[PDB]
Structures are given as C-alpha cells and as structure tokens.
CSV table of C-alpha atoms (C1' of nucleotides) and ligand atoms in Angstrom, one decimal:
chain,number,residue,atom,x,y,z
A,1248,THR,CA,-62.7,36.9,-35.9
A,1249,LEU,CA,-66.0,38.8,-35.6
A,1250,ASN,CA,-67.8,35.6,-34.3
A,1251,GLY,CA,-65.3,33.5,-32.6
A,1252,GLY,CA,-66.9,32.4,-29.2
A,1253,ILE,CA,-69.7,30.8,-31.5
A,1254,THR,CA,-67.1,29.2,-33.6
A,1255,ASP,CA,-65.4,27.9,-31.3
A,1256,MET,CA,-68.4,26.6,-28.9
A,1257,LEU,CA,-68.9,24.5,-32.1
A,1258,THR,CA,-65.6,22.8,-32.9
A,1259,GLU,CA,-65.5,22.4,-29.1
A,1260,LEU,CA,-68.9,20.4,-30.1
A,1261,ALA,CA,-67.5,19.0,-32.9
A,1262,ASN,CA,-65.0,17.6,-31.4
A,1263,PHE,CA,-67.3,16.2,-28.1
A,1264,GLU,CA,-68.8,14.2,-31.3
A,1265,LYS,CA,-65.8,13.0,-33.3
A,1266,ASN,CA,-64.0,11.5,-30.4
A,1267,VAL,CA,-66.3,10.8,-28.1
A,1268,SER,CA,-70.1,10.3,-29.0
A,1269,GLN,CA,-68.2,8.7,-32.4
A,1270,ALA,CA,-70.1,10.4,-34.2
A,1271,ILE,CA,-69.2,11.5,-37.4
A,1272,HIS,CA,-71.8,13.0,-39.2
A,1273,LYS,CA,-72.7,15.5,-36.8
A,1274,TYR,CA,-68.7,16.2,-36.3
A,1275,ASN,CA,-69.3,17.1,-39.6
A,1276,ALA,CA,-72.7,18.9,-39.3
A,1277,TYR,CA,-71.2,21.2,-36.8
A,1278,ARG,CA,-67.7,21.9,-38.7
A,1279,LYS,CA,-69.8,23.2,-41.6
A,1280,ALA,CA,-71.9,25.6,-38.9
A,1281,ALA,CA,-68.5,26.8,-37.8
A,1282,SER,CA,-67.3,27.2,-41.2
A,1283,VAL,CA,-70.3,28.9,-42.8
A,1284,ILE,CA,-70.3,31.1,-39.8
A,1285,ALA,CA,-66.2,32.1,-39.4
A,1286,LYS,CA,-66.5,33.7,-43.4
A,1287,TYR,CA,-69.8,35.5,-42.1
A,1288,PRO,CA,-69.3,39.4,-42.7
A,1289,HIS,CA,-71.1,40.5,-39.5
A,1290,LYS,CA,-71.0,40.1,-35.8
A,1291,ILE,CA,-74.1,37.7,-34.9
A,1292,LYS,CA,-76.8,38.6,-33.4
A,1293,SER,CA,-78.9,36.6,-33.3
A,1294,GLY,CA,-80.1,32.4,-33.6
A,1295,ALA,CA,-82.5,33.7,-36.5
A,1296,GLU,CA,-79.8,35.7,-38.3
A,1297,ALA,CA,-77.3,32.2,-37.7
A,1298,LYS,CA,-79.6,30.0,-39.0
A,1299,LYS,CA,-80.0,31.5,-42.2
A,1300,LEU,CA,-77.0,30.3,-43.1
A,1301,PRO,CA,-77.0,26.7,-44.8
A,1302,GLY,CA,-75.0,24.0,-42.3
A,1303,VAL,CA,-76.6,26.4,-39.2
A,1304,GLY,CA,-80.2,24.2,-39.0
A,1305,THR,CA,-82.9,24.8,-35.6
A,1306,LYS,CA,-80.4,22.9,-33.2
A,1307,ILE,CA,-77.2,25.0,-33.5
A,1308,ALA,CA,-79.5,28.2,-33.8
A,1309,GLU,CA,-80.7,27.4,-30.1
A,1310,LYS,CA,-77.5,26.5,-29.3
A,1311,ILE,CA,-76.0,30.4,-29.9
A,1312,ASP,CA,-79.2,31.9,-28.8
A,1313,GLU,CA,-77.7,30.5,-25.3
A,1314,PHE,CA,-74.4,31.3,-25.8
A,1315,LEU,CA,-75.5,35.1,-27.4
A,1316,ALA,CA,-77.3,35.7,-23.7
A,1317,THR,CA,-75.5,34.1,-21.3
A,1318,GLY,CA,-71.4,33.6,-22.9
A,1319,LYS,CA,-71.8,29.7,-21.8
A,1320,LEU,CA,-73.3,27.0,-23.0
A,1321,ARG,CA,-74.4,24.2,-20.2
A,1322,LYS,CA,-74.2,21.4,-22.6
A,1323,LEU,CA,-70.8,22.2,-22.8
A,1324,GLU,CA,-70.3,23.1,-19.3
A,1325,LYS,CA,-71.7,19.7,-18.5
A,1326,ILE,CA,-69.3,17.9,-20.6
A,1327,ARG,CA,-66.6,19.7,-19.9
A,1328,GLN,CA,-67.2,18.4,-16.4
A,1329,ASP,CA,-67.3,15.1,-17.0
A,1330,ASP,CA,-64.1,12.7,-16.1
A,1331,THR,CA,-64.8,10.3,-19.1
A,1332,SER,CA,-65.4,13.1,-21.8
A,1333,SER,CA,-62.1,15.0,-20.1
A,1334,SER,CA,-59.8,12.0,-20.2
A,1335,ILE,CA,-60.8,10.5,-24.1
A,1336,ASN,CA,-61.3,14.1,-25.2
A,1337,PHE,CA,-57.6,14.2,-23.7
A,1338,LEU,CA,-56.4,11.2,-25.3
A,1339,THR,CA,-57.3,11.8,-29.5
A,1340,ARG,CA,-55.1,14.5,-28.8
A,1341,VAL,CA,-51.5,12.8,-28.8
A,1342,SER,CA,-51.4,11.3,-32.6
A,1343,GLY,CA,-51.7,7.5,-33.3
A,1344,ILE,CA,-54.6,8.2,-31.3
A,1345,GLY,CA,-58.2,8.4,-31.7
A,1346,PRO,CA,-61.7,7.5,-30.4
A,1347,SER,CA,-62.1,3.8,-30.0
A,1348,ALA,CA,-57.8,3.8,-28.9
A,1349,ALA,CA,-58.9,6.8,-26.3
A,1350,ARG,CA,-61.8,5.0,-25.0
A,1351,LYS,CA,-59.7,2.0,-24.5
A,1352,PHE,CA,-57.2,3.0,-22.6
A,1353,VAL,CA,-59.3,5.4,-20.1
A,1354,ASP,CA,-61.7,1.6,-19.4
A,1355,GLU,CA,-57.7,0.7,-18.3
A,1356,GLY,CA,-57.7,3.5,-16.6
A,1357,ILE,CA,-54.4,5.2,-18.4
A,1358,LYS,CA,-56.3,9.0,-18.8
A,1359,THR,CA,-53.5,11.6,-17.9
A,1360,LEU,CA,-50.4,12.3,-19.5
A,1361,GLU,CA,-48.5,10.5,-16.7
A,1362,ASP,CA,-50.5,7.8,-17.2
A,1363,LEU,CA,-49.4,7.5,-21.3
A,1364,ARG,CA,-45.9,7.8,-20.3
A,1365,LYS,CA,-45.9,5.3,-17.3
A,1366,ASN,CA,-47.4,2.6,-20.4
A,1367,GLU,CA,-45.9,3.3,-23.0
A,1368,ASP,CA,-45.7,-0.4,-24.1
A,1369,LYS,CA,-49.6,-0.5,-24.6
A,1370,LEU,CA,-48.8,1.8,-27.5
A,1371,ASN,CA,-48.5,1.4,-31.0
A,1372,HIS,CA,-45.2,2.4,-32.8
A,1373,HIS,CA,-47.3,6.0,-33.9
A,1374,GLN,CA,-48.6,6.5,-30.6
A,1375,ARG,CA,-45.6,6.5,-28.9
A,1376,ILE,CA,-44.0,8.7,-31.2
A,1377,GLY,CA,-46.4,11.0,-30.7
A,1378,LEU,CA,-46.3,10.5,-26.7
A,1379,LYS,CA,-42.8,11.3,-27.5
A,1380,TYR,CA,-43.1,14.9,-28.9
A,1381,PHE,CA,-46.6,15.6,-27.8
A,1382,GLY,CA,-44.6,19.1,-26.9
A,1383,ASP,CA,-43.7,19.8,-29.6
A,1384,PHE,CA,-47.3,18.8,-31.7
A,1385,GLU,CA,-49.6,21.0,-30.0
A,1386,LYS,CA,-47.2,24.1,-31.5
A,1387,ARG,CA,-47.6,25.8,-34.8
A,1388,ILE,CA,-45.4,26.6,-37.2
A,1389,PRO,CA,-44.5,30.1,-37.5
A,1390,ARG,CA,-44.5,31.0,-41.9
A,1391,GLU,CA,-40.9,31.8,-41.7
A,1392,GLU,CA,-39.7,28.7,-40.9
A,1393,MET,CA,-41.7,27.0,-42.7
A,1394,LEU,CA,-39.7,29.1,-45.6
A,1395,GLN,CA,-36.8,27.6,-44.5
A,1396,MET,CA,-38.3,24.1,-44.0
A,1397,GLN,CA,-38.8,24.8,-47.5
A,1398,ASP,CA,-35.0,25.2,-47.8
A,1399,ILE,CA,-33.6,22.4,-47.3
A,1400,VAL,CA,-37.1,19.9,-48.0
A,1401,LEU,CA,-36.5,21.2,-52.3
A,1402,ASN,CA,-32.5,21.0,-51.8
A,1403,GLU,CA,-32.1,17.9,-50.5
A,1404,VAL,CA,-34.9,16.7,-52.7
A,1405,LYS,CA,-33.0,18.0,-55.9
A,1406,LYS,CA,-29.8,16.5,-55.0
A,1407,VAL,CA,-31.0,12.9,-54.8
A,1408,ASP,CA,-32.5,13.8,-58.9
A,1409,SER,CA,-33.4,17.7,-60.2
A,1410,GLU,CA,-36.4,16.1,-62.2
A,1411,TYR,CA,-38.2,16.1,-58.9
A,1412,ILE,CA,-40.5,18.6,-58.7
A,1413,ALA,CA,-41.8,19.4,-54.7
A,1414,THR,CA,-43.5,21.6,-53.3
A,1415,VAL,CA,-45.0,23.0,-50.7
A,1416,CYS,CA,-49.3,22.2,-49.6
A,1417,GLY,CA,-51.7,22.5,-47.2
A,1418,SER,CA,-52.2,26.0,-45.3
A,1419,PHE,CA,-48.6,26.9,-46.3
A,1420,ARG,CA,-49.9,27.0,-50.2
A,1421,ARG,CA,-53.0,28.9,-48.7
A,1422,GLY,CA,-50.4,31.5,-47.5
A,1423,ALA,CA,-51.2,31.0,-43.6
A,1424,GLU,CA,-48.6,32.9,-41.3
A,1425,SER,CA,-48.6,29.7,-39.3
A,1426,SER,CA,-49.2,26.2,-40.3
A,1427,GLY,CA,-49.5,23.2,-37.8
A,1428,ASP,CA,-47.5,21.4,-39.9
A,1429,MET,CA,-46.0,20.6,-43.4
A,1430,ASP,CA,-47.3,18.9,-46.7
A,1431,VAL,CA,-44.9,18.3,-49.2
A,1432,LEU,CA,-46.5,17.0,-52.6
A,1433,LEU,CA,-43.2,15.4,-54.6
A,1434,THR,CA,-43.1,14.3,-58.9
A,1435,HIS,CA,-41.3,12.9,-60.6
A,1436,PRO,CA,-41.8,12.2,-64.7
A,1437,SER,CA,-40.4,8.5,-63.4
A,1438,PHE,CA,-44.1,8.2,-61.9
A,1439,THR,CA,-47.1,8.6,-63.8
A,1440,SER,CA,-51.0,6.7,-64.6
A,1441,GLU,CA,-49.1,4.9,-66.7
A,1442,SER,CA,-46.2,3.6,-66.0
A,1443,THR,CA,-43.9,3.6,-62.3
A,1444,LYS,CA,-40.7,3.5,-64.4
A,1445,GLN,CA,-38.5,4.0,-60.8
A,1446,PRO,CA,-39.0,2.0,-57.6
A,1447,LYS,CA,-38.4,3.7,-53.9
A,1448,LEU,CA,-39.2,7.1,-55.4
A,1449,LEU,CA,-40.6,8.3,-51.9
A,1450,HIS,CA,-38.2,5.6,-49.9
A,1451,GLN,CA,-35.3,7.7,-51.8
A,1452,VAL,CA,-36.3,10.8,-51.2
A,1453,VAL,CA,-36.9,10.1,-47.4
A,1454,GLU,CA,-33.1,8.5,-47.1
A,1455,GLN,CA,-32.5,11.6,-47.9
A,1456,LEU,CA,-34.0,13.9,-45.6
A,1457,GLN,CA,-33.3,11.0,-42.9
A,1458,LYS,CA,-29.4,11.2,-43.8
A,1459,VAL,CA,-29.0,15.2,-43.0
A,1460,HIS,CA,-31.1,14.8,-39.9
A,1461,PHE,CA,-34.1,16.7,-40.9
A,1462,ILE,CA,-36.6,13.6,-40.8
A,1463,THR,CA,-36.6,12.1,-37.7
A,1464,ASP,CA,-39.2,9.9,-37.5
A,1465,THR,CA,-41.2,8.1,-39.5
A,1466,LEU,CA,-45.4,7.8,-38.5
A,1467,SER,CA,-46.2,6.0,-41.1
A,1468,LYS,CA,-44.7,5.1,-45.0
A,1469,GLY,CA,-45.9,3.5,-48.0
A,1470,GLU,CA,-44.8,3.4,-52.1
A,1471,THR,CA,-47.0,7.3,-51.8
A,1472,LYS,CA,-47.1,8.2,-47.9
A,1473,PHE,CA,-45.2,9.2,-46.3
A,1474,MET,CA,-46.0,10.3,-42.6
A,1475,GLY,CA,-43.4,11.7,-39.9
A,1476,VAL,CA,-41.7,13.9,-37.9
A,1477,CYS,CA,-38.7,17.0,-38.7
A,1478,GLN,CA,-36.4,19.2,-36.9
A,1479,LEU,CA,-35.2,22.5,-38.5
A,1480,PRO,CA,-31.4,23.2,-37.3
A,1481,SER,CA,-30.4,25.1,-34.9
A,1482,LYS,CA,-27.4,26.9,-34.4
A,1483,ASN,CA,-24.3,27.1,-31.7
A,1484,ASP,CA,-25.7,27.6,-27.8
A,1485,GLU,CA,-29.5,28.0,-29.3
A,1486,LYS,CA,-32.3,25.9,-28.3
A,1487,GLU,CA,-33.2,23.5,-30.1
A,1488,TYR,CA,-36.7,24.4,-32.8
A,1489,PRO,CA,-39.6,22.0,-31.5
A,1490,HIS,CA,-40.5,19.0,-33.4
A,1491,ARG,CA,-42.7,19.4,-36.1
A,1492,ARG,CA,-45.8,17.0,-37.9
A,1493,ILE,CA,-44.5,16.3,-41.9
A,1494,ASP,CA,-46.5,14.8,-45.1
A,1495,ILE,CA,-45.2,13.9,-48.0
A,1496,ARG,CA,-47.3,12.8,-51.2
A,1497,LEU,CA,-45.8,11.5,-54.1
A,1498,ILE,CA,-48.5,11.7,-56.7
A,1499,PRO,CA,-48.4,10.4,-60.5
A,1500,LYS,CA,-46.5,13.8,-62.8
A,1501,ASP,CA,-49.2,14.1,-64.8
A,1502,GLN,CA,-52.6,14.3,-62.2
A,1503,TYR,CA,-50.4,17.1,-60.4
A,1504,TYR,CA,-53.6,19.1,-60.6
A,1505,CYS,CA,-56.0,17.4,-58.9
A,1506,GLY,CA,-53.0,16.4,-56.6
A,1507,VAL,CA,-52.2,19.8,-55.3
A,1508,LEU,CA,-55.5,20.7,-55.6
A,1509,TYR,CA,-56.4,18.2,-53.1
A,1510,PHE,CA,-52.9,19.1,-51.1
A,1511,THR,CA,-53.4,22.3,-50.3
A,1512,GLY,CA,-57.1,22.3,-48.9
A,1513,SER,CA,-58.9,22.8,-46.8
A,1514,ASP,CA,-59.8,19.9,-45.4
A,1515,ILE,CA,-63.5,21.4,-45.2
A,1516,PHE,CA,-63.4,23.1,-48.6
A,1517,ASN,CA,-62.5,19.3,-50.4
A,1518,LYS,CA,-65.7,18.1,-48.9
A,1519,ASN,CA,-67.8,20.9,-50.0
A,1520,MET,CA,-66.0,21.1,-53.7
A,1521,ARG,CA,-66.6,16.9,-53.7
A,1522,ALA,CA,-69.9,17.7,-52.4
A,1523,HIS,CA,-70.4,20.1,-55.1
A,1524,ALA,CA,-69.0,17.7,-58.1
A,1525,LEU,CA,-71.4,15.0,-56.4
A,1526,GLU,CA,-74.5,17.6,-57.5
A,1527,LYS,CA,-73.0,18.0,-60.7
A,1528,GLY,CA,-72.2,14.7,-61.4
A,1529,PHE,CA,-68.4,14.3,-61.2
A,1530,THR,CA,-66.6,12.7,-58.8
A,1531,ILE,CA,-62.7,14.2,-57.4
A,1532,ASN,CA,-60.3,12.5,-56.0
A,1533,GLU,CA,-56.6,13.0,-55.9
A,1534,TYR,CA,-56.3,11.6,-59.5
A,1535,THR,CA,-59.0,12.5,-61.7
A,1536,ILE,CA,-62.1,13.9,-62.2
A,1537,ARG,CA,-64.6,12.0,-63.5
A,1538,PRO,CA,-67.9,12.0,-64.8
A,1539,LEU,CA,-70.7,9.9,-63.0
A,1540,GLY,CA,-72.7,7.4,-65.0
A,1541,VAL,CA,-76.3,7.4,-64.7
A,1542,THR,CA,-75.5,4.5,-62.5
A,1543,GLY,CA,-73.3,6.1,-60.5
A,1544,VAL,CA,-70.2,4.5,-61.7
A,1545,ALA,CA,-67.9,6.7,-62.6
A,1546,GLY,CA,-66.3,7.1,-65.9
A,1547,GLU,CA,-63.2,8.1,-67.6
A,1548,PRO,CA,-60.8,10.5,-66.5
A,1549,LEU,CA,-61.7,14.3,-68.5
A,1550,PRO,CA,-59.0,16.3,-69.0
A,1551,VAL,CA,-57.0,18.6,-67.1
A,1552,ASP,CA,-54.7,21.2,-67.2
A,1553,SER,CA,-54.7,23.6,-64.1
A,1554,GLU,CA,-56.3,23.5,-61.5
A,1555,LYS,CA,-58.7,26.0,-62.8
A,1556,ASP,CA,-60.1,23.4,-65.4
A,1557,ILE,CA,-61.5,21.2,-62.4
A,1558,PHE,CA,-64.0,24.4,-61.3
A,1559,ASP,CA,-65.1,24.6,-64.3
A,1560,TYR,CA,-66.3,21.0,-65.3
A,1561,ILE,CA,-68.5,21.6,-61.4
A,1562,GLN,CA,-69.7,25.1,-62.8
A,1563,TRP,CA,-66.9,26.9,-59.7
A,1564,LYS,CA,-65.3,30.6,-60.7
A,1565,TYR,CA,-62.1,29.6,-59.6
A,1566,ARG,CA,-60.6,30.3,-56.2
A,1567,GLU,CA,-56.7,30.9,-55.1
A,1568,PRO,CA,-55.6,28.7,-52.5
A,1569,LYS,CA,-55.7,31.3,-49.8
A,1570,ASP,CA,-59.3,31.7,-50.7
A,1571,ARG,CA,-60.0,28.4,-49.9
A,1572,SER,CA,-59.1,28.0,-46.6
A,1573,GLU,CA,-62.9,27.3,-45.0
B,1045,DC,C1',-90.0,13.8,-43.7
B,1046,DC,C1',-85.7,11.0,-45.1
B,1047,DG,C1',-81.3,9.3,-45.4
B,1048,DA,C1',-77.6,10.1,-48.2
B,1049,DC,C1',-73.7,13.5,-46.6
B,1050,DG,C1',-65.5,13.0,-50.2
B,1051,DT,C1',-62.4,10.6,-50.9
B,1052,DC,C1',-58.2,7.5,-50.4
B,1053,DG,C1',-53.1,6.0,-48.3
B,1054,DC,C1',-50.7,3.2,-44.0
B,1055,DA,C1',-50.8,0.5,-39.9
B,1056,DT,C1',-53.1,-3.6,-37.9
B,1057,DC,C1',-56.6,-6.9,-36.8
B,1058,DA,C1',-59.9,-11.1,-37.7
B,1059,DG,C1',-60.6,-15.3,-40.8
B,1060,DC,C1',-58.3,-17.9,-43.9
C,1139,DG,C1',-48.7,-16.1,-46.8
C,1140,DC,C1',-53.6,-13.3,-48.9
C,1141,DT,C1',-58.0,-10.4,-48.7
C,1142,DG,C1',-61.3,-7.4,-46.5
C,1143,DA,C1',-62.8,-4.4,-42.3
C,1144,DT,C1',-61.5,-1.0,-39.5
C,1145,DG,C1',-58.8,2.4,-37.1
C,1146,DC,C1',-56.2,6.7,-38.2
C,1147,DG,C1',-54.6,10.4,-40.5
C,1148,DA,C1',-54.1,13.3,-45.6
D,151,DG,C1',-77.4,17.8,-37.5
D,152,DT,C1',-79.0,19.9,-41.3
D,153,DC,C1',-81.3,19.8,-45.1
D,154,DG,C1',-83.5,18.9,-50.9
D,155,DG,C1',-86.7,16.9,-53.0
E,2727,0KX,N1,-59.9,15.4,-43.5
E,2727,0KX,C1,-58.9,15.7,-44.5
E,2727,0KX,C2,-57.4,16.4,-43.6
E,2727,0KX,C3,-56.4,16.7,-45.3
E,2727,0KX,N2,-56.7,17.2,-46.3
E,2727,0KX,C4,-55.9,17.2,-47.4
E,2727,0KX,C5,-56.5,18.9,-47.7
E,2727,0KX,C6,-56.1,19.7,-46.3
E,2727,0KX,O1,-55.7,20.6,-46.6
E,2727,0KX,C7,-54.8,18.6,-46.3
E,2727,0KX,C8,-53.4,18.1,-46.0
E,2727,0KX,O2,-54.2,17.9,-44.4
E,2727,0KX,P1,-53.7,19.0,-43.1
E,2727,0KX,O3,-52.3,18.9,-42.6
E,2727,0KX,O4,-54.3,18.2,-41.9
E,2727,0KX,N3,-54.4,20.3,-42.9
E,2727,0KX,P2,-53.7,21.8,-43.7
E,2727,0KX,O5,-52.9,21.9,-44.1
E,2727,0KX,O6,-55.2,22.3,-44.5
E,2727,0KX,O7,-53.6,22.6,-42.3
E,2727,0KX,P3,-53.0,22.5,-41.0
E,2727,0KX,O8,-53.7,22.2,-39.5
E,2727,0KX,O9,-51.7,21.7,-41.1
E,2727,0KX,O10,-52.2,24.3,-40.8
E,2727,0KX,O11,-54.7,17.4,-46.8
E,2727,0KX,C9,-58.3,16.5,-46.2
E,2727,0KX,O12,-58.5,16.3,-47.1
E,2727,0KX,N4,-58.8,16.0,-45.2
E,2728,MN,MN1,-51.4,20.5,-42.9
E,2729,MN,MN1,-50.3,17.4,-42.9
E,2730,NA,NA1,-80.0,27.2,-42.4
E,2731,NA,NA1,-54.9,11.4,-32.0
DNA sequence: CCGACGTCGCATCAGC
DNA sequence: GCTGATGCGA
DNA sequence: GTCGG
C-alpha cells in the first residue's frame, strides 16, 4: 500500500457519489482510478505522474496534487461536515439500505443507529436483519475461520447429496487472508443449461445448513441465489463467533467455468473483463460467453472447458484467481 | 468534444 | 394474479 | 469522471 492515502481518498469520493449523489458512473470512475493506482508499484509523487495511468483523468490528478501537498482534500473535508451527507452515507452501511432508502429515512428524521433501532417497523425484512447484525457485519473474517466454514458447508452439502459440488469463491478463492463474507458456488448434475431434473436443489441445501444452525437468517432466496446469514459453532464457555454474511449461487453444472469466473471476481475485475470482451466483440455473463453480431444481438454460446478458454477468446493472458484482485 | 461505459438474481411496487 | 420498472445486491 | 474515435 504505497499509495494508501490516495486510494482511501478516492474510495471515499466513490462512496459519496454512490450514496449521496446517486451518480453511479462517478462511483465507477473513482473506483477504477483507485484500483489502477492501488497496483501501481511506485509511491506517487504528483498528479501528473498519476494522470499517466488510465482512469486517472484531469479532475482526479488535481485532487492528488492537493492531497499530496496538504494531506487532505477540502472537498471531502466539507462532505464530512455535512449533516445530510454523513447521515445518508451512514445509513447505507446497513445491509438492505441503499442510497434511495437512506435519503428517505433521513427525510423523516431517521438518521442515527438509535433512530433505526426505534423504528424497526419502518424496515423491510432485509433491512431489519442488516440492522440486527450491523455490528457483526462490520467485522472481517480471518481466513482461518473461512477454512472452518468451508469445512461445514462442504460436509453438510455432501450429506444432502454426494453429487453436489460446492466451491468457495469470492475473495477466499483469490487467496485473501481475510474476507468480507463467504461466497459458495453450488452445482448438481440434475441442473444444467438444458434441464432441471430435480426441484428445490438450492432449497434442500439451505434447509440442511439451517437444521445444523449454521445458517441463521435469510436476506433473500430464489431458485438459484441465496443471500443470508451464518455463524460458526463455538465451544463451551467460549464467546460466540460474529454472525457472517453468506451468498450461495447454484449454477448449471455444464456452465461451471463461466460461473466460477464470475463468482471469483473481484467486482472491478469482472467489470473490466466484461468491458474488454465487448471491445473484442463478445459478451460474458455467469453462464456463457457469446459473440456479438454486427447487429449487437448476442449469438450462440461458445464452447468453454476452462476458465482460461474464456481468457483466450478475448485475447487476455490467463490470470490466476490471486491475481484478479482489482 | 461525446455518450458509452458489466451483467444478472430477488424483493418490492405500480399499473392493470 | 401478471408484467415491467426500480432498488439493492452478487 | 474518463477518454476513444
Ligand atoms: N458488483 C459486483 C459484486 C460482486 N461480483 C461477483 C464477483 C465478486 O468477487 C463476487 C462475490 O461478491 P462479494 O462477496 O460482494 N465480493 P468479494 O468476495 O470479492 O470480496 P469480499 O468483500 O467478500 O472479501 O461476486 C460482481 O461481479 N459484481
Ligand atoms: Mn465475498
Ligand atoms: Mn458475497
Ligand atoms: Na489517464
Ligand atoms: Na446498504
């Protein structure tokens, strides 16, 4: 983290633009700049040095000059002082509360943690669970706990049906020493792009993880995606582990490589890779890579037998999971 | 200069 | 009820 | 907010 001060600054600008301004492309611009600067292997000494980097334009270069000369940015100094901004920015930290609801809550004079706790009846289910575990969801997960969680998820899934394959993705698969949550990719032979021979494939798994008190709460759930809450079991007289977010994605088994590419991330890596695909005239989702007809209309799914196959189509040298952390 | 900028799942609402 | 848009999230 | 064409 040679340039921690700069990337911190930009990320806070990105978060302001998303949460307060509701300007998503500015949020994306700041995040790209932050990402490209994070991996730049020199300590940056000027706005002009940084502007060489793609994603760093004129405006951000000027901010880096100010930041480097003073250690602060007056634009942020002011945002930090603004009641409305700070309130809105804070409320969005609760899972299920985004920019729209946070500004609406603020409009009704709900703007502190205490105000949320008194107005639980004004929250939807997701927001209510997010409020409940606000404290725990602030804490990161040590990789060592991630390994214990992996153990449990894989063994419980096996007990439901040995032909399930469960794969932990996200920052875990990228080798991170701590993660924000756990991401689990699920496949089963009965669910392919061509047919769903068995129903409740995700539900049965979720049910089992609840039965053993691993999954404690549900934020959302359908046939292919689960979002919820889980907790490691603790020992006698031990303090309980924090509750953790968990996401599960059931992917058609024949489309595992697109699915694991997607769920491994990072989010910025996926966005840049999909953008680059479009420049090369392909489109990538979690299921397929497809060519773009001169029209614009996507064509038929191309054969894919490895993650690398996907990289090969768009003329990118392969990158290991641990190197996709943009 | 200029829009053109990843892709999709589930919850909730509006309009019918 | 269904359809399609909006919010929030992966 | 950036920038390719
Ligand atoms: N905007 C987003 C968010 C998520 N992702 C897909 C890939 C991200 O790695 C991933 C899993 O989402 P995530 O859990 O929110 N982030 P990730 O696991 O990479 O890092 P953590 O903050 O969980 O440690 O899903 C995406 O493609 N676009
Ligand atoms: Mn994750
Ligand atoms: Mn996740
Ligand atoms: Na640049
Ligand atoms: Na939120």
